[PDB]
Amino acid sequence: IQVTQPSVVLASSHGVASFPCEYSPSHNTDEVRVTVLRQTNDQMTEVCATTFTEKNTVGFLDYPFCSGTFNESRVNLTIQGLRAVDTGLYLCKVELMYPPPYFVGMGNGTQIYVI
Amino acid sequence: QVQLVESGGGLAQPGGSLRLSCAASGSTISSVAVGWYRQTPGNQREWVATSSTSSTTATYADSVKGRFTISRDNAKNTIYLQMNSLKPEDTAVYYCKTGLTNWGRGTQVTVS
């Protein structure tokens, strides 16, 4: 699957940044896992991840610093507690988990600059 | 955005066949995996099968594997579920779906 996310996003003074992650085509699924990853010099580390279903469209409830609502084939993501040093490349990974077939796609990454 | 319309439902005898249709309007489903689900009285909609895509083959639940077949008709922007060797327990309302929540209106299938 194709995954679209913005090239560049400016975080707030409060350390908050929002950006959408959208995939296509909108294959049948009942379980979508969205993982946010940070690229750090060869290593990809997990920032936060959740699983969206038809009844649970509001995700990352178990994270203080990550929020996300899912609709159509689009997650609107919000990362909090960003610092200047947290400037970097944030990749949206999308997985269609059930039922078969499995699909996986990886966004190009959103560069996040922190004011 | 895609509106899905089921048809072909009705009554069949045990051992009989029905061909269900999921016709899409709005945009094309030529490239979208389309799922089929069935709902018995008092239960949740349950996955039955998903159509092929450019990169994947059709998939089936083991309860219908070998009896049911999904085929495409791009020109009619439609997916077909061929239902052979029907059983009374195949009785249900059948829905097609794309994405997470884009359900059709469902069509009743009754096997005596």
mmCIF file with all atom_site columns, C-alpha atoms in Angstrom:
data_model
loop_
_atom_site.group_PDB
_atom_site.id
_atom_site.type_symbol
_atom_site.label_atom_id
_atom_site.label_alt_id
_atom_site.label_comp_id
_atom_site.label_asym_id
_atom_site.label_entity_id
_atom_site.label_seq_id
_atom_site.pdbx_PDB_ins_code
_atom_site.Cartn_x
_atom_site.Cartn_y
_atom_site.Cartn_z
_atom_site.occupancy
_atom_site.B_iso_or_equiv
_atom_site.pdbx_formal_charge
_atom_site.auth_seq_id
_atom_site.auth_comp_id
_atom_site.auth_asym_id
_atom_site.auth_atom_id
_atom_site.pdbx_PDB_model_num
ATOM 1   C CA . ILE A 1 1   ? 0.000   0.000   0.000   1.00 0.00 ? 1   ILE A CA 1
ATOM 2   C CA . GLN A 1 2   ? 0.933   3.654   -0.654  1.00 0.00 ? 2   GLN A CA 1
ATOM 3   C CA . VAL A 1 3   ? 1.367   5.865   2.424   1.00 0.00 ? 3   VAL A CA 1
ATOM 4   C CA . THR A 1 4   ? 1.165   9.669   2.236   1.00 0.00 ? 4   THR A CA 1
ATOM 5   C CA . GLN A 1 5   ? 2.496   12.041  4.940   1.00 0.00 ? 5   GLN A CA 1
ATOM 6   C CA . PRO A 1 6   ? 3.767   15.663  4.725   1.00 0.00 ? 6   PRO A CA 1
ATOM 7   C CA . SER A 1 7   ? 7.445   16.317  3.962   1.00 0.00 ? 7   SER A CA 1
ATOM 8   C CA . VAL A 1 8   ? 7.808   18.946  6.667   1.00 0.00 ? 8   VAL A CA 1
ATOM 9   C CA . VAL A 1 9   ? 5.914   20.035  9.782   1.00 0.00 ? 9   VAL A CA 1
ATOM 10  C CA . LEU A 1 10  ? 6.572   22.785  12.353  1.00 0.00 ? 10  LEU A CA 1
ATOM 11  C CA . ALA A 1 11  ? 6.045   21.893  16.010  1.00 0.00 ? 11  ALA A CA 1
ATOM 12  C CA . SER A 1 12  ? 4.527   24.493  18.368  1.00 0.00 ? 12  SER A CA 1
ATOM 13  C CA . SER A 1 13  ? 6.328   26.362  21.154  1.00 0.00 ? 13  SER A CA 1
ATOM 14  C CA . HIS A 1 14  ? 4.466   24.023  23.519  1.00 0.00 ? 14  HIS A CA 1
ATOM 15  C CA . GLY A 1 15  ? 6.210   21.118  21.723  1.00 0.00 ? 15  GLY A CA 1
ATOM 16  C CA . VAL A 1 16  ? 3.170   19.904  19.782  1.00 0.00 ? 16  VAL A CA 1
ATOM 17  C CA . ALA A 1 17  ? 3.176   18.795  16.152  1.00 0.00 ? 17  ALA A CA 1
ATOM 18  C CA . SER A 1 18  ? 0.304   17.470  14.039  1.00 0.00 ? 18  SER A CA 1
ATOM 19  C CA . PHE A 1 19  ? 0.356   15.749  10.655  1.00 0.00 ? 19  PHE A CA 1
ATOM 20  C CA . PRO A 1 20  ? -1.887  13.337  8.740   1.00 0.00 ? 20  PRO A CA 1
ATOM 21  C CA . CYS A 1 21  ? -0.966  9.873   7.582   1.00 0.00 ? 21  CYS A CA 1
ATOM 22  C CA . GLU A 1 22  ? -3.091  8.480   4.794   1.00 0.00 ? 22  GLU A CA 1
ATOM 23  C CA . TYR A 1 23  ? -2.926  5.248   2.871   1.00 0.00 ? 23  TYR A CA 1
ATOM 24  C CA . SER A 1 24  ? -4.387  3.909   -0.379  1.00 0.00 ? 24  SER A CA 1
ATOM 25  C CA . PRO A 1 25  ? -6.007  2.003   -1.813  1.00 0.00 ? 25  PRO A CA 1
ATOM 26  C CA . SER A 1 26  ? -8.534  1.594   0.979   1.00 0.00 ? 26  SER A CA 1
ATOM 27  C CA . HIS A 1 27  ? -8.453  -2.192  1.094   1.00 0.00 ? 27  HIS A CA 1
ATOM 28  C CA . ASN A 1 28  ? -10.907 -4.073  3.217   1.00 0.00 ? 28  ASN A CA 1
ATOM 29  C CA . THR A 1 29  ? -9.713  -4.462  6.781   1.00 0.00 ? 29  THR A CA 1
ATOM 30  C CA . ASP A 1 30  ? -11.056 -4.625  10.355  1.00 0.00 ? 30  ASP A CA 1
ATOM 31  C CA . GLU A 1 31  ? -7.844  -3.755  12.160  1.00 0.00 ? 31  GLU A CA 1
ATOM 32  C CA . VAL A 1 32  ? -5.365  -1.030  11.234  1.00 0.00 ? 32  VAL A CA 1
ATOM 33  C CA . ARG A 1 33  ? -2.081  -0.698  13.111  1.00 0.00 ? 33  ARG A CA 1
ATOM 34  C CA . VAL A 1 34  ? -0.348  2.667   12.838  1.00 0.00 ? 34  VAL A CA 1
ATOM 35  C CA . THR A 1 35  ? 3.213   2.906   14.071  1.00 0.00 ? 35  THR A CA 1
ATOM 36  C CA . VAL A 1 36  ? 5.140   6.155   14.367  1.00 0.00 ? 36  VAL A CA 1
ATOM 37  C CA . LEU A 1 37  ? 8.885   5.705   14.051  1.00 0.00 ? 37  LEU A CA 1
ATOM 38  C CA . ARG A 1 38  ? 11.806  8.113   14.338  1.00 0.00 ? 38  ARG A CA 1
ATOM 39  C CA . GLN A 1 39  ? 14.773  7.710   11.981  1.00 0.00 ? 39  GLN A CA 1
ATOM 40  C CA . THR A 1 40  ? 18.022  8.212   13.897  1.00 0.00 ? 40  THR A CA 1
ATOM 41  C CA . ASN A 1 41  ? 21.219  7.545   11.944  1.00 0.00 ? 41  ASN A CA 1
ATOM 42  C CA . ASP A 1 42  ? 20.618  4.007   10.608  1.00 0.00 ? 42  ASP A CA 1
ATOM 43  C CA . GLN A 1 43  ? 18.250  3.014   13.445  1.00 0.00 ? 43  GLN A CA 1
ATOM 44  C CA . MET A 1 44  ? 14.462  3.209   13.358  1.00 0.00 ? 44  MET A CA 1
ATOM 45  C CA . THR A 1 45  ? 13.022  3.522   16.871  1.00 0.00 ? 45  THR A CA 1
ATOM 46  C CA . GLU A 1 46  ? 9.331   3.293   17.787  1.00 0.00 ? 46  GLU A CA 1
ATOM 47  C CA . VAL A 1 47  ? 7.735   6.492   19.071  1.00 0.00 ? 47  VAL A CA 1
ATOM 48  C CA . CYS A 1 48  ? 4.156   5.187   19.545  1.00 0.00 ? 48  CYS A CA 1
ATOM 49  C CA . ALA A 1 49  ? 1.709   2.659   18.041  1.00 0.00 ? 49  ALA A CA 1
ATOM 50  C CA . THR A 1 50  ? -1.981  1.855   18.157  1.00 0.00 ? 50  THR A CA 1
ATOM 51  C CA . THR A 1 51  ? -4.626  -0.329  16.584  1.00 0.00 ? 51  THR A CA 1
ATOM 52  C CA . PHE A 1 52  ? -7.745  1.261   15.094  1.00 0.00 ? 52  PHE A CA 1
ATOM 53  C CA . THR A 1 53  ? -11.034 -0.615  14.567  1.00 0.00 ? 53  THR A CA 1
ATOM 54  C CA . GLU A 1 54  ? -14.534 0.397   13.480  1.00 0.00 ? 54  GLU A CA 1
ATOM 55  C CA . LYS A 1 55  ? -15.506 1.114   17.079  1.00 0.00 ? 55  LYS A CA 1
ATOM 56  C CA . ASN A 1 56  ? -12.158 2.536   18.248  1.00 0.00 ? 56  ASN A CA 1
ATOM 57  C CA . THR A 1 57  ? -11.330 5.462   15.970  1.00 0.00 ? 57  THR A CA 1
ATOM 58  C CA . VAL A 1 58  ? -9.560  7.377   18.791  1.00 0.00 ? 58  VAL A CA 1
ATOM 59  C CA . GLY A 1 59  ? -6.169  5.789   19.498  1.00 0.00 ? 59  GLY A CA 1
ATOM 60  C CA . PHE A 1 60  ? -2.950  6.127   21.518  1.00 0.00 ? 60  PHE A CA 1
ATOM 61  C CA . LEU A 1 61  ? -5.023  6.189   24.724  1.00 0.00 ? 61  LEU A CA 1
ATOM 62  C CA . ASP A 1 62  ? -2.134  4.458   26.487  1.00 0.00 ? 62  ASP A CA 1
ATOM 63  C CA . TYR A 1 63  ? 0.323   7.231   25.588  1.00 0.00 ? 63  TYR A CA 1
ATOM 64  C CA . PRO A 1 64  ? 0.635   10.657  27.272  1.00 0.00 ? 64  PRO A CA 1
ATOM 65  C CA . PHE A 1 65  ? 2.524   12.166  24.340  1.00 0.00 ? 65  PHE A CA 1
ATOM 66  C CA . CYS A 1 66  ? 0.785   10.692  21.285  1.00 0.00 ? 66  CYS A CA 1
ATOM 67  C CA . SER A 1 67  ? -2.775  11.185  20.011  1.00 0.00 ? 67  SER A CA 1
ATOM 68  C CA . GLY A 1 68  ? -4.574  9.921   16.911  1.00 0.00 ? 68  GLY A CA 1
ATOM 69  C CA . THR A 1 69  ? -8.029  9.750   15.362  1.00 0.00 ? 69  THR A CA 1
ATOM 70  C CA . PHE A 1 70  ? -8.743  7.434   12.399  1.00 0.00 ? 70  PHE A CA 1
ATOM 71  C CA . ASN A 1 71  ? -11.241 8.054   9.615   1.00 0.00 ? 71  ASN A CA 1
ATOM 72  C CA . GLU A 1 72  ? -11.624 6.690   6.045   1.00 0.00 ? 72  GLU A CA 1
ATOM 73  C CA . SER A 1 73  ? -8.013  5.695   5.476   1.00 0.00 ? 73  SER A CA 1
ATOM 74  C CA . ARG A 1 74  ? -6.493  8.664   7.279   1.00 0.00 ? 74  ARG A CA 1
ATOM 75  C CA . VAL A 1 75  ? -4.947  8.967   10.748  1.00 0.00 ? 75  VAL A CA 1
ATOM 76  C CA . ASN A 1 76  ? -4.519  12.450  12.107  1.00 0.00 ? 76  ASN A CA 1
ATOM 77  C CA . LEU A 1 77  ? -1.501  12.239  14.389  1.00 0.00 ? 77  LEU A CA 1
ATOM 78  C CA . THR A 1 78  ? -0.381  14.584  17.170  1.00 0.00 ? 78  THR A CA 1
ATOM 79  C CA . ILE A 1 79  ? 2.950   14.241  18.978  1.00 0.00 ? 79  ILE A CA 1
ATOM 80  C CA . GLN A 1 80  ? 3.519   16.159  22.221  1.00 0.00 ? 80  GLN A CA 1
ATOM 81  C CA . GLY A 1 81  ? 6.491   16.963  24.460  1.00 0.00 ? 81  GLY A CA 1
ATOM 82  C CA . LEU A 1 82  ? 8.741   17.612  21.459  1.00 0.00 ? 82  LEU A CA 1
ATOM 83  C CA . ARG A 1 83  ? 12.059  19.372  22.181  1.00 0.00 ? 83  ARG A CA 1
ATOM 84  C CA . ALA A 1 84  ? 14.535  21.142  19.903  1.00 0.00 ? 84  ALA A CA 1
ATOM 85  C CA . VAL A 1 85  ? 16.689  18.007  19.997  1.00 0.00 ? 85  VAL A CA 1
ATOM 86  C CA . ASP A 1 86  ? 13.650  16.007  18.842  1.00 0.00 ? 86  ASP A CA 1
ATOM 87  C CA . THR A 1 87  ? 14.056  17.603  15.424  1.00 0.00 ? 87  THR A CA 1
ATOM 88  C CA . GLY A 1 88  ? 14.097  14.668  13.014  1.00 0.00 ? 88  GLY A CA 1
ATOM 89  C CA . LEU A 1 89  ? 12.381  12.322  10.556  1.00 0.00 ? 89  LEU A CA 1
ATOM 90  C CA . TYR A 1 90  ? 9.142   10.667  11.667  1.00 0.00 ? 90  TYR A CA 1
ATOM 91  C CA . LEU A 1 91  ? 7.859   7.736   9.644   1.00 0.00 ? 91  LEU A CA 1
ATOM 92  C CA . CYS A 1 92  ? 4.274   6.567   9.494   1.00 0.00 ? 92  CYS A CA 1
ATOM 93  C CA . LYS A 1 93  ? 3.985   2.811   9.121   1.00 0.00 ? 93  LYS A CA 1
ATOM 94  C CA . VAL A 1 94  ? 0.536   1.439   8.252   1.00 0.00 ? 94  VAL A CA 1
ATOM 95  C CA . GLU A 1 95  ? -0.490  -2.193  8.543   1.00 0.00 ? 95  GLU A CA 1
ATOM 96  C CA . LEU A 1 96  ? -3.818  -3.764  7.554   1.00 0.00 ? 96  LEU A CA 1
ATOM 97  C CA . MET A 1 97  ? -3.841  -6.592  10.087  1.00 0.00 ? 97  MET A CA 1
ATOM 98  C CA . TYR A 1 98  ? -7.077  -8.574  9.599   1.00 0.00 ? 98  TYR A CA 1
ATOM 99  C CA . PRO A 1 99  ? -8.618  -10.208 7.685   1.00 0.00 ? 99  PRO A CA 1
ATOM 100 C CA . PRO A 1 100 ? -6.195  -11.645 5.097   1.00 0.00 ? 100 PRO A CA 1
ATOM 101 C CA . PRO A 1 101 ? -4.590  -10.374 3.075   1.00 0.00 ? 101 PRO A CA 1
ATOM 102 C CA . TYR A 1 102 ? -2.111  -8.463  5.162   1.00 0.00 ? 102 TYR A CA 1
ATOM 103 C CA . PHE A 1 103 ? -0.898  -5.159  3.678   1.00 0.00 ? 103 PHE A CA 1
ATOM 104 C CA . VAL A 1 104 ? 1.955   -2.982  4.935   1.00 0.00 ? 104 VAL A CA 1
ATOM 105 C CA . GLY A 1 105 ? 3.174   0.412   3.760   1.00 0.00 ? 105 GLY A CA 1
ATOM 106 C CA . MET A 1 106 ? 5.708   2.947   5.008   1.00 0.00 ? 106 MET A CA 1
ATOM 107 C CA . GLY A 1 107 ? 5.414   6.720   4.514   1.00 0.00 ? 107 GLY A CA 1
ATOM 108 C CA . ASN A 1 108 ? 8.413   8.763   3.240   1.00 0.00 ? 108 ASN A CA 1
ATOM 109 C CA . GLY A 1 109 ? 8.644   10.442  6.620   1.00 0.00 ? 109 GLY A CA 1
ATOM 110 C CA . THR A 1 110 ? 7.690   13.800  8.022   1.00 0.00 ? 110 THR A CA 1
ATOM 111 C CA . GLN A 1 111 ? 10.553  16.071  9.024   1.00 0.00 ? 111 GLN A CA 1
ATOM 112 C CA . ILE A 1 112 ? 9.657   17.753  12.307  1.00 0.00 ? 112 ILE A CA 1
ATOM 113 C CA . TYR A 1 113 ? 11.327  21.046  13.214  1.00 0.00 ? 113 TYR A CA 1
ATOM 114 C CA . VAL A 1 114 ? 10.838  22.259  16.738  1.00 0.00 ? 114 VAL A CA 1
ATOM 115 C CA . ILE A 1 115 ? 10.643  26.002  17.425  1.00 0.00 ? 115 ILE A CA 1
ATOM 116 C CA . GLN B 2 1   ? -15.471 7.340   -1.897  1.00 0.00 ? 1   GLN B CA 1
ATOM 117 C CA . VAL B 2 2   ? -17.414 4.247   -2.999  1.00 0.00 ? 2   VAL B CA 1
ATOM 118 C CA . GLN B 2 3   ? -21.052 3.166   -2.518  1.00 0.00 ? 3   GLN B CA 1
ATOM 119 C CA . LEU B 2 4   ? -21.515 -0.611  -2.441  1.00 0.00 ? 4   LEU B CA 1
ATOM 120 C CA . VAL B 2 5   ? -24.802 -2.302  -3.437  1.00 0.00 ? 5   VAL B CA 1
ATOM 121 C CA . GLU B 2 6   ? -25.436 -6.024  -2.838  1.00 0.00 ? 6   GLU B CA 1
ATOM 122 C CA . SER B 2 7   ? -27.908 -8.165  -4.780  1.00 0.00 ? 7   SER B CA 1
ATOM 123 C CA . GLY B 2 8   ? -28.473 -11.736 -5.903  1.00 0.00 ? 8   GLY B CA 1
ATOM 124 C CA . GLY B 2 9   ? -29.767 -12.734 -2.506  1.00 0.00 ? 9   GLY B CA 1
ATOM 125 C CA . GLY B 2 10  ? -32.928 -14.792 -2.107  1.00 0.00 ? 10  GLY B CA 1
ATOM 126 C CA . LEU B 2 11  ? -33.820 -18.354 -1.198  1.00 0.00 ? 11  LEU B CA 1
ATOM 127 C CA . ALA B 2 12  ? -31.934 -21.434 -2.299  1.00 0.00 ? 12  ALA B CA 1
ATOM 128 C CA . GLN B 2 13  ? -32.363 -25.096 -1.445  1.00 0.00 ? 13  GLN B CA 1
ATOM 129 C CA . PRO B 2 14  ? -29.700 -27.044 0.470   1.00 0.00 ? 14  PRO B CA 1
ATOM 130 C CA . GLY B 2 15  ? -27.155 -28.013 -2.196  1.00 0.00 ? 15  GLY B CA 1
ATOM 131 C CA . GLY B 2 16  ? -28.054 -25.099 -4.450  1.00 0.00 ? 16  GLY B CA 1
ATOM 132 C CA . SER B 2 17  ? -26.180 -22.089 -5.773  1.00 0.00 ? 17  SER B CA 1
ATOM 133 C CA . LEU B 2 18  ? -26.603 -18.314 -5.690  1.00 0.00 ? 18  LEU B CA 1
ATOM 134 C CA . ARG B 2 19  ? -24.410 -15.638 -7.187  1.00 0.00 ? 19  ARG B CA 1
ATOM 135 C CA . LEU B 2 20  ? -24.216 -12.447 -5.126  1.00 0.00 ? 20  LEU B CA 1
ATOM 136 C CA . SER B 2 21  ? -23.219 -9.112  -6.631  1.00 0.00 ? 21  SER B CA 1
ATOM 137 C CA . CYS B 2 22  ? -21.440 -6.182  -5.020  1.00 0.00 ? 22  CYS B CA 1
ATOM 138 C CA . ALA B 2 23  ? -21.801 -3.311  -7.462  1.00 0.00 ? 23  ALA B CA 1
ATOM 139 C CA . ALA B 2 24  ? -19.842 -0.155  -6.681  1.00 0.00 ? 24  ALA B CA 1
ATOM 140 C CA . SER B 2 25  ? -20.597 3.376   -7.811  1.00 0.00 ? 25  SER B CA 1
ATOM 141 C CA . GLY B 2 26  ? -18.786 6.672   -7.142  1.00 0.00 ? 26  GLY B CA 1
ATOM 142 C CA . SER B 2 27  ? -15.264 5.597   -8.006  1.00 0.00 ? 27  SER B CA 1
ATOM 143 C CA . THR B 2 28  ? -13.744 2.302   -9.142  1.00 0.00 ? 28  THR B CA 1
ATOM 144 C CA . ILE B 2 29  ? -13.032 -0.729  -6.944  1.00 0.00 ? 29  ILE B CA 1
ATOM 145 C CA . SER B 2 30  ? -10.722 -2.228  -9.603  1.00 0.00 ? 30  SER B CA 1
ATOM 146 C CA . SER B 2 31  ? -7.709  -1.824  -7.340  1.00 0.00 ? 31  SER B CA 1
ATOM 147 C CA . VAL B 2 32  ? -9.355  -2.254  -3.923  1.00 0.00 ? 32  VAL B CA 1
ATOM 148 C CA . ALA B 2 33  ? -9.557  -5.460  -1.885  1.00 0.00 ? 33  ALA B CA 1
ATOM 149 C CA . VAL B 2 34  ? -13.296 -5.927  -1.328  1.00 0.00 ? 34  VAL B CA 1
ATOM 150 C CA . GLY B 2 35  ? -14.479 -7.989  1.611   1.00 0.00 ? 35  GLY B CA 1
ATOM 151 C CA . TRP B 2 36  ? -17.597 -10.143 1.972   1.00 0.00 ? 36  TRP B CA 1
ATOM 152 C CA . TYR B 2 37  ? -19.208 -10.588 5.363   1.00 0.00 ? 37  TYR B CA 1
ATOM 153 C CA . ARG B 2 38  ? -22.233 -12.400 6.679   1.00 0.00 ? 38  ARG B CA 1
ATOM 154 C CA . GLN B 2 39  ? -24.413 -11.713 9.709   1.00 0.00 ? 39  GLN B CA 1
ATOM 155 C CA . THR B 2 40  ? -26.686 -14.304 11.318  1.00 0.00 ? 40  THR B CA 1
ATOM 156 C CA . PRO B 2 41  ? -29.529 -13.228 13.660  1.00 0.00 ? 41  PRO B CA 1
ATOM 157 C CA . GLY B 2 42  ? -28.100 -11.723 16.830  1.00 0.00 ? 42  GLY B CA 1
ATOM 158 C CA . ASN B 2 43  ? -24.453 -11.990 15.811  1.00 0.00 ? 43  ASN B CA 1
ATOM 159 C CA . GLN B 2 44  ? -21.779 -9.678  14.454  1.00 0.00 ? 44  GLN B CA 1
ATOM 160 C CA . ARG B 2 45  ? -20.912 -9.296  10.802  1.00 0.00 ? 45  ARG B CA 1
ATOM 161 C CA . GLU B 2 46  ? -18.351 -11.985 10.111  1.00 0.00 ? 46  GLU B CA 1
ATOM 162 C CA . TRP B 2 47  ? -15.658 -12.103 7.454   1.00 0.00 ? 47  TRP B CA 1
ATOM 163 C CA . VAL B 2 48  ? -16.273 -14.573 4.651   1.00 0.00 ? 48  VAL B CA 1
ATOM 164 C CA . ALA B 2 49  ? -13.863 -13.670 1.820   1.00 0.00 ? 49  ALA B CA 1
ATOM 165 C CA . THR B 2 50  ? -11.836 -10.892 0.223   1.00 0.00 ? 50  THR B CA 1
ATOM 166 C CA . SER B 2 51  ? -11.287 -10.295 -3.498  1.00 0.00 ? 51  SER B CA 1
ATOM 167 C CA . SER B 2 52  ? -7.956  -10.295 -5.268  1.00 0.00 ? 52  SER B CA 1
ATOM 168 C CA . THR B 2 53  ? -5.974  -7.116  -5.950  1.00 0.00 ? 53  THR B CA 1
ATOM 169 C CA . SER B 2 54  ? -3.010  -6.347  -8.245  1.00 0.00 ? 54  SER B CA 1
ATOM 170 C CA . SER B 2 55  ? -0.626  -7.972  -5.764  1.00 0.00 ? 55  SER B CA 1
ATOM 171 C CA . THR B 2 56  ? -2.755  -10.440 -3.781  1.00 0.00 ? 56  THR B CA 1
ATOM 172 C CA . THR B 2 57  ? -4.898  -13.503 -4.429  1.00 0.00 ? 57  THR B CA 1
ATOM 173 C CA . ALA B 2 58  ? -8.447  -13.925 -3.147  1.00 0.00 ? 58  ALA B CA 1
ATOM 174 C CA . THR B 2 59  ? -8.784  -14.999 0.481   1.00 0.00 ? 59  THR B CA 1
ATOM 175 C CA . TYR B 2 60  ? -11.467 -17.162 2.134   1.00 0.00 ? 60  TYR B CA 1
ATOM 176 C CA . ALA B 2 61  ? -12.621 -18.127 5.634   1.00 0.00 ? 61  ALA B CA 1
ATOM 177 C CA . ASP B 2 62  ? -12.235 -21.868 6.240   1.00 0.00 ? 62  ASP B CA 1
ATOM 178 C CA . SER B 2 63  ? -15.999 -22.203 6.714   1.00 0.00 ? 63  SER B CA 1
ATOM 179 C CA . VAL B 2 64  ? -16.594 -21.376 3.042   1.00 0.00 ? 64  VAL B CA 1
ATOM 180 C CA . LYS B 2 65  ? -13.263 -22.413 1.524   1.00 0.00 ? 65  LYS B CA 1
ATOM 181 C CA . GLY B 2 66  ? -13.806 -24.483 -1.610  1.00 0.00 ? 66  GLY B CA 1
ATOM 182 C CA . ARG B 2 67  ? -17.516 -23.729 -1.794  1.00 0.00 ? 67  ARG B CA 1
ATOM 183 C CA . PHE B 2 68  ? -17.377 -19.976 -2.376  1.00 0.00 ? 68  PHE B CA 1
ATOM 184 C CA . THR B 2 69  ? -15.566 -18.103 -5.158  1.00 0.00 ? 69  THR B CA 1
ATOM 185 C CA . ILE B 2 70  ? -14.913 -14.374 -5.593  1.00 0.00 ? 70  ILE B CA 1
ATOM 186 C CA . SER B 2 71  ? -14.578 -12.950 -9.097  1.00 0.00 ? 71  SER B CA 1
ATOM 187 C CA . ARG B 2 72  ? -14.224 -9.443  -10.548 1.00 0.00 ? 72  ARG B CA 1
ATOM 188 C CA . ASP B 2 73  ? -16.027 -7.562  -13.317 1.00 0.00 ? 73  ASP B CA 1
ATOM 189 C CA . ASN B 2 74  ? -14.087 -4.289  -13.686 1.00 0.00 ? 74  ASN B CA 1
ATOM 190 C CA . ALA B 2 75  ? -16.245 -3.162  -16.601 1.00 0.00 ? 75  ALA B CA 1
ATOM 191 C CA . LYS B 2 76  ? -19.324 -3.311  -14.386 1.00 0.00 ? 76  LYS B CA 1
ATOM 192 C CA . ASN B 2 77  ? -17.250 -2.059  -11.436 1.00 0.00 ? 77  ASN B CA 1
ATOM 193 C CA . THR B 2 78  ? -18.545 -5.132  -9.548  1.00 0.00 ? 78  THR B CA 1
ATOM 194 C CA . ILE B 2 79  ? -17.362 -8.072  -7.427  1.00 0.00 ? 79  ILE B CA 1
ATOM 195 C CA . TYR B 2 80  ? -19.195 -11.413 -7.467  1.00 0.00 ? 80  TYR B CA 1
ATOM 196 C CA . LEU B 2 81  ? -19.458 -14.015 -4.728  1.00 0.00 ? 81  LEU B CA 1
ATOM 197 C CA . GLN B 2 82  ? -20.281 -17.397 -6.251  1.00 0.00 ? 82  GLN B CA 1
ATOM 198 C CA . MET B 2 83  ? -21.951 -19.492 -3.549  1.00 0.00 ? 83  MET B CA 1
ATOM 199 C CA . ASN B 2 84  ? -22.036 -23.221 -4.336  1.00 0.00 ? 84  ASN B CA 1
ATOM 200 C CA . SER B 2 85  ? -23.020 -26.260 -2.300  1.00 0.00 ? 85  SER B CA 1
ATOM 201 C CA . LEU B 2 86  ? -25.112 -24.121 0.067   1.00 0.00 ? 86  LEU B CA 1
ATOM 202 C CA . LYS B 2 87  ? -25.997 -25.226 3.598   1.00 0.00 ? 87  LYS B CA 1
ATOM 203 C CA . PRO B 2 88  ? -28.791 -23.992 5.888   1.00 0.00 ? 88  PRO B CA 1
ATOM 204 C CA . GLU B 2 89  ? -26.052 -22.471 8.077   1.00 0.00 ? 89  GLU B CA 1
ATOM 205 C CA . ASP B 2 90  ? -25.047 -20.235 5.173   1.00 0.00 ? 90  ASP B CA 1
ATOM 206 C CA . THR B 2 91  ? -28.270 -18.364 5.976   1.00 0.00 ? 91  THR B CA 1
ATOM 207 C CA . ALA B 2 92  ? -27.424 -14.748 6.787   1.00 0.00 ? 92  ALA B CA 1
ATOM 208 C CA . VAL B 2 93  ? -27.471 -11.210 5.509   1.00 0.00 ? 93  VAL B CA 1
ATOM 209 C CA . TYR B 2 94  ? -24.388 -10.760 3.285   1.00 0.00 ? 94  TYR B CA 1
ATOM 210 C CA . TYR B 2 95  ? -22.478 -7.491  3.122   1.00 0.00 ? 95  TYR B CA 1
ATOM 211 C CA . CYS B 2 96  ? -19.583 -6.325  1.024   1.00 0.00 ? 96  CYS B CA 1
ATOM 212 C CA . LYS B 2 97  ? -17.150 -3.794  2.496   1.00 0.00 ? 97  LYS B CA 1
ATOM 213 C CA . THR B 2 98  ? -14.132 -1.677  1.544   1.00 0.00 ? 98  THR B CA 1
ATOM 214 C CA . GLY B 2 99  ? -11.856 -0.034  4.090   1.00 0.00 ? 99  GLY B CA 1
ATOM 215 C CA . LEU B 2 100 ? -12.772 -0.243  7.728   1.00 0.00 ? 100 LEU B CA 1
ATOM 216 C CA . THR B 2 101 ? -16.409 0.879   7.661   1.00 0.00 ? 101 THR B CA 1
ATOM 217 C CA . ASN B 2 102 ? -17.622 1.258   4.101   1.00 0.00 ? 102 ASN B CA 1
ATOM 218 C CA . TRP B 2 103 ? -20.409 -1.342  4.277   1.00 0.00 ? 103 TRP B CA 1
ATOM 219 C CA . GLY B 2 104 ? -22.980 -1.968  1.554   1.00 0.00 ? 104 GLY B CA 1
ATOM 220 C CA . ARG B 2 105 ? -26.675 -2.304  2.456   1.00 0.00 ? 105 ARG B CA 1
ATOM 221 C CA . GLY B 2 106 ? -26.569 -6.102  2.769   1.00 0.00 ? 106 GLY B CA 1
ATOM 222 C CA . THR B 2 107 ? -28.680 -8.741  1.027   1.00 0.00 ? 107 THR B CA 1
ATOM 223 C CA . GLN B 2 108 ? -30.553 -11.590 2.737   1.00 0.00 ? 108 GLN B CA 1
ATOM 224 C CA . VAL B 2 109 ? -29.682 -15.178 1.760   1.00 0.00 ? 109 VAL B CA 1
ATOM 225 C CA . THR B 2 110 ? -31.988 -17.934 2.976   1.00 0.00 ? 110 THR B CA 1
ATOM 226 C CA . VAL B 2 111 ? -31.270 -21.650 2.656   1.00 0.00 ? 111 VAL B CA 1
ATOM 227 C CA . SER B 2 112 ? -34.238 -23.841 3.712   1.00 0.00 ? 112 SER B CA 1
#
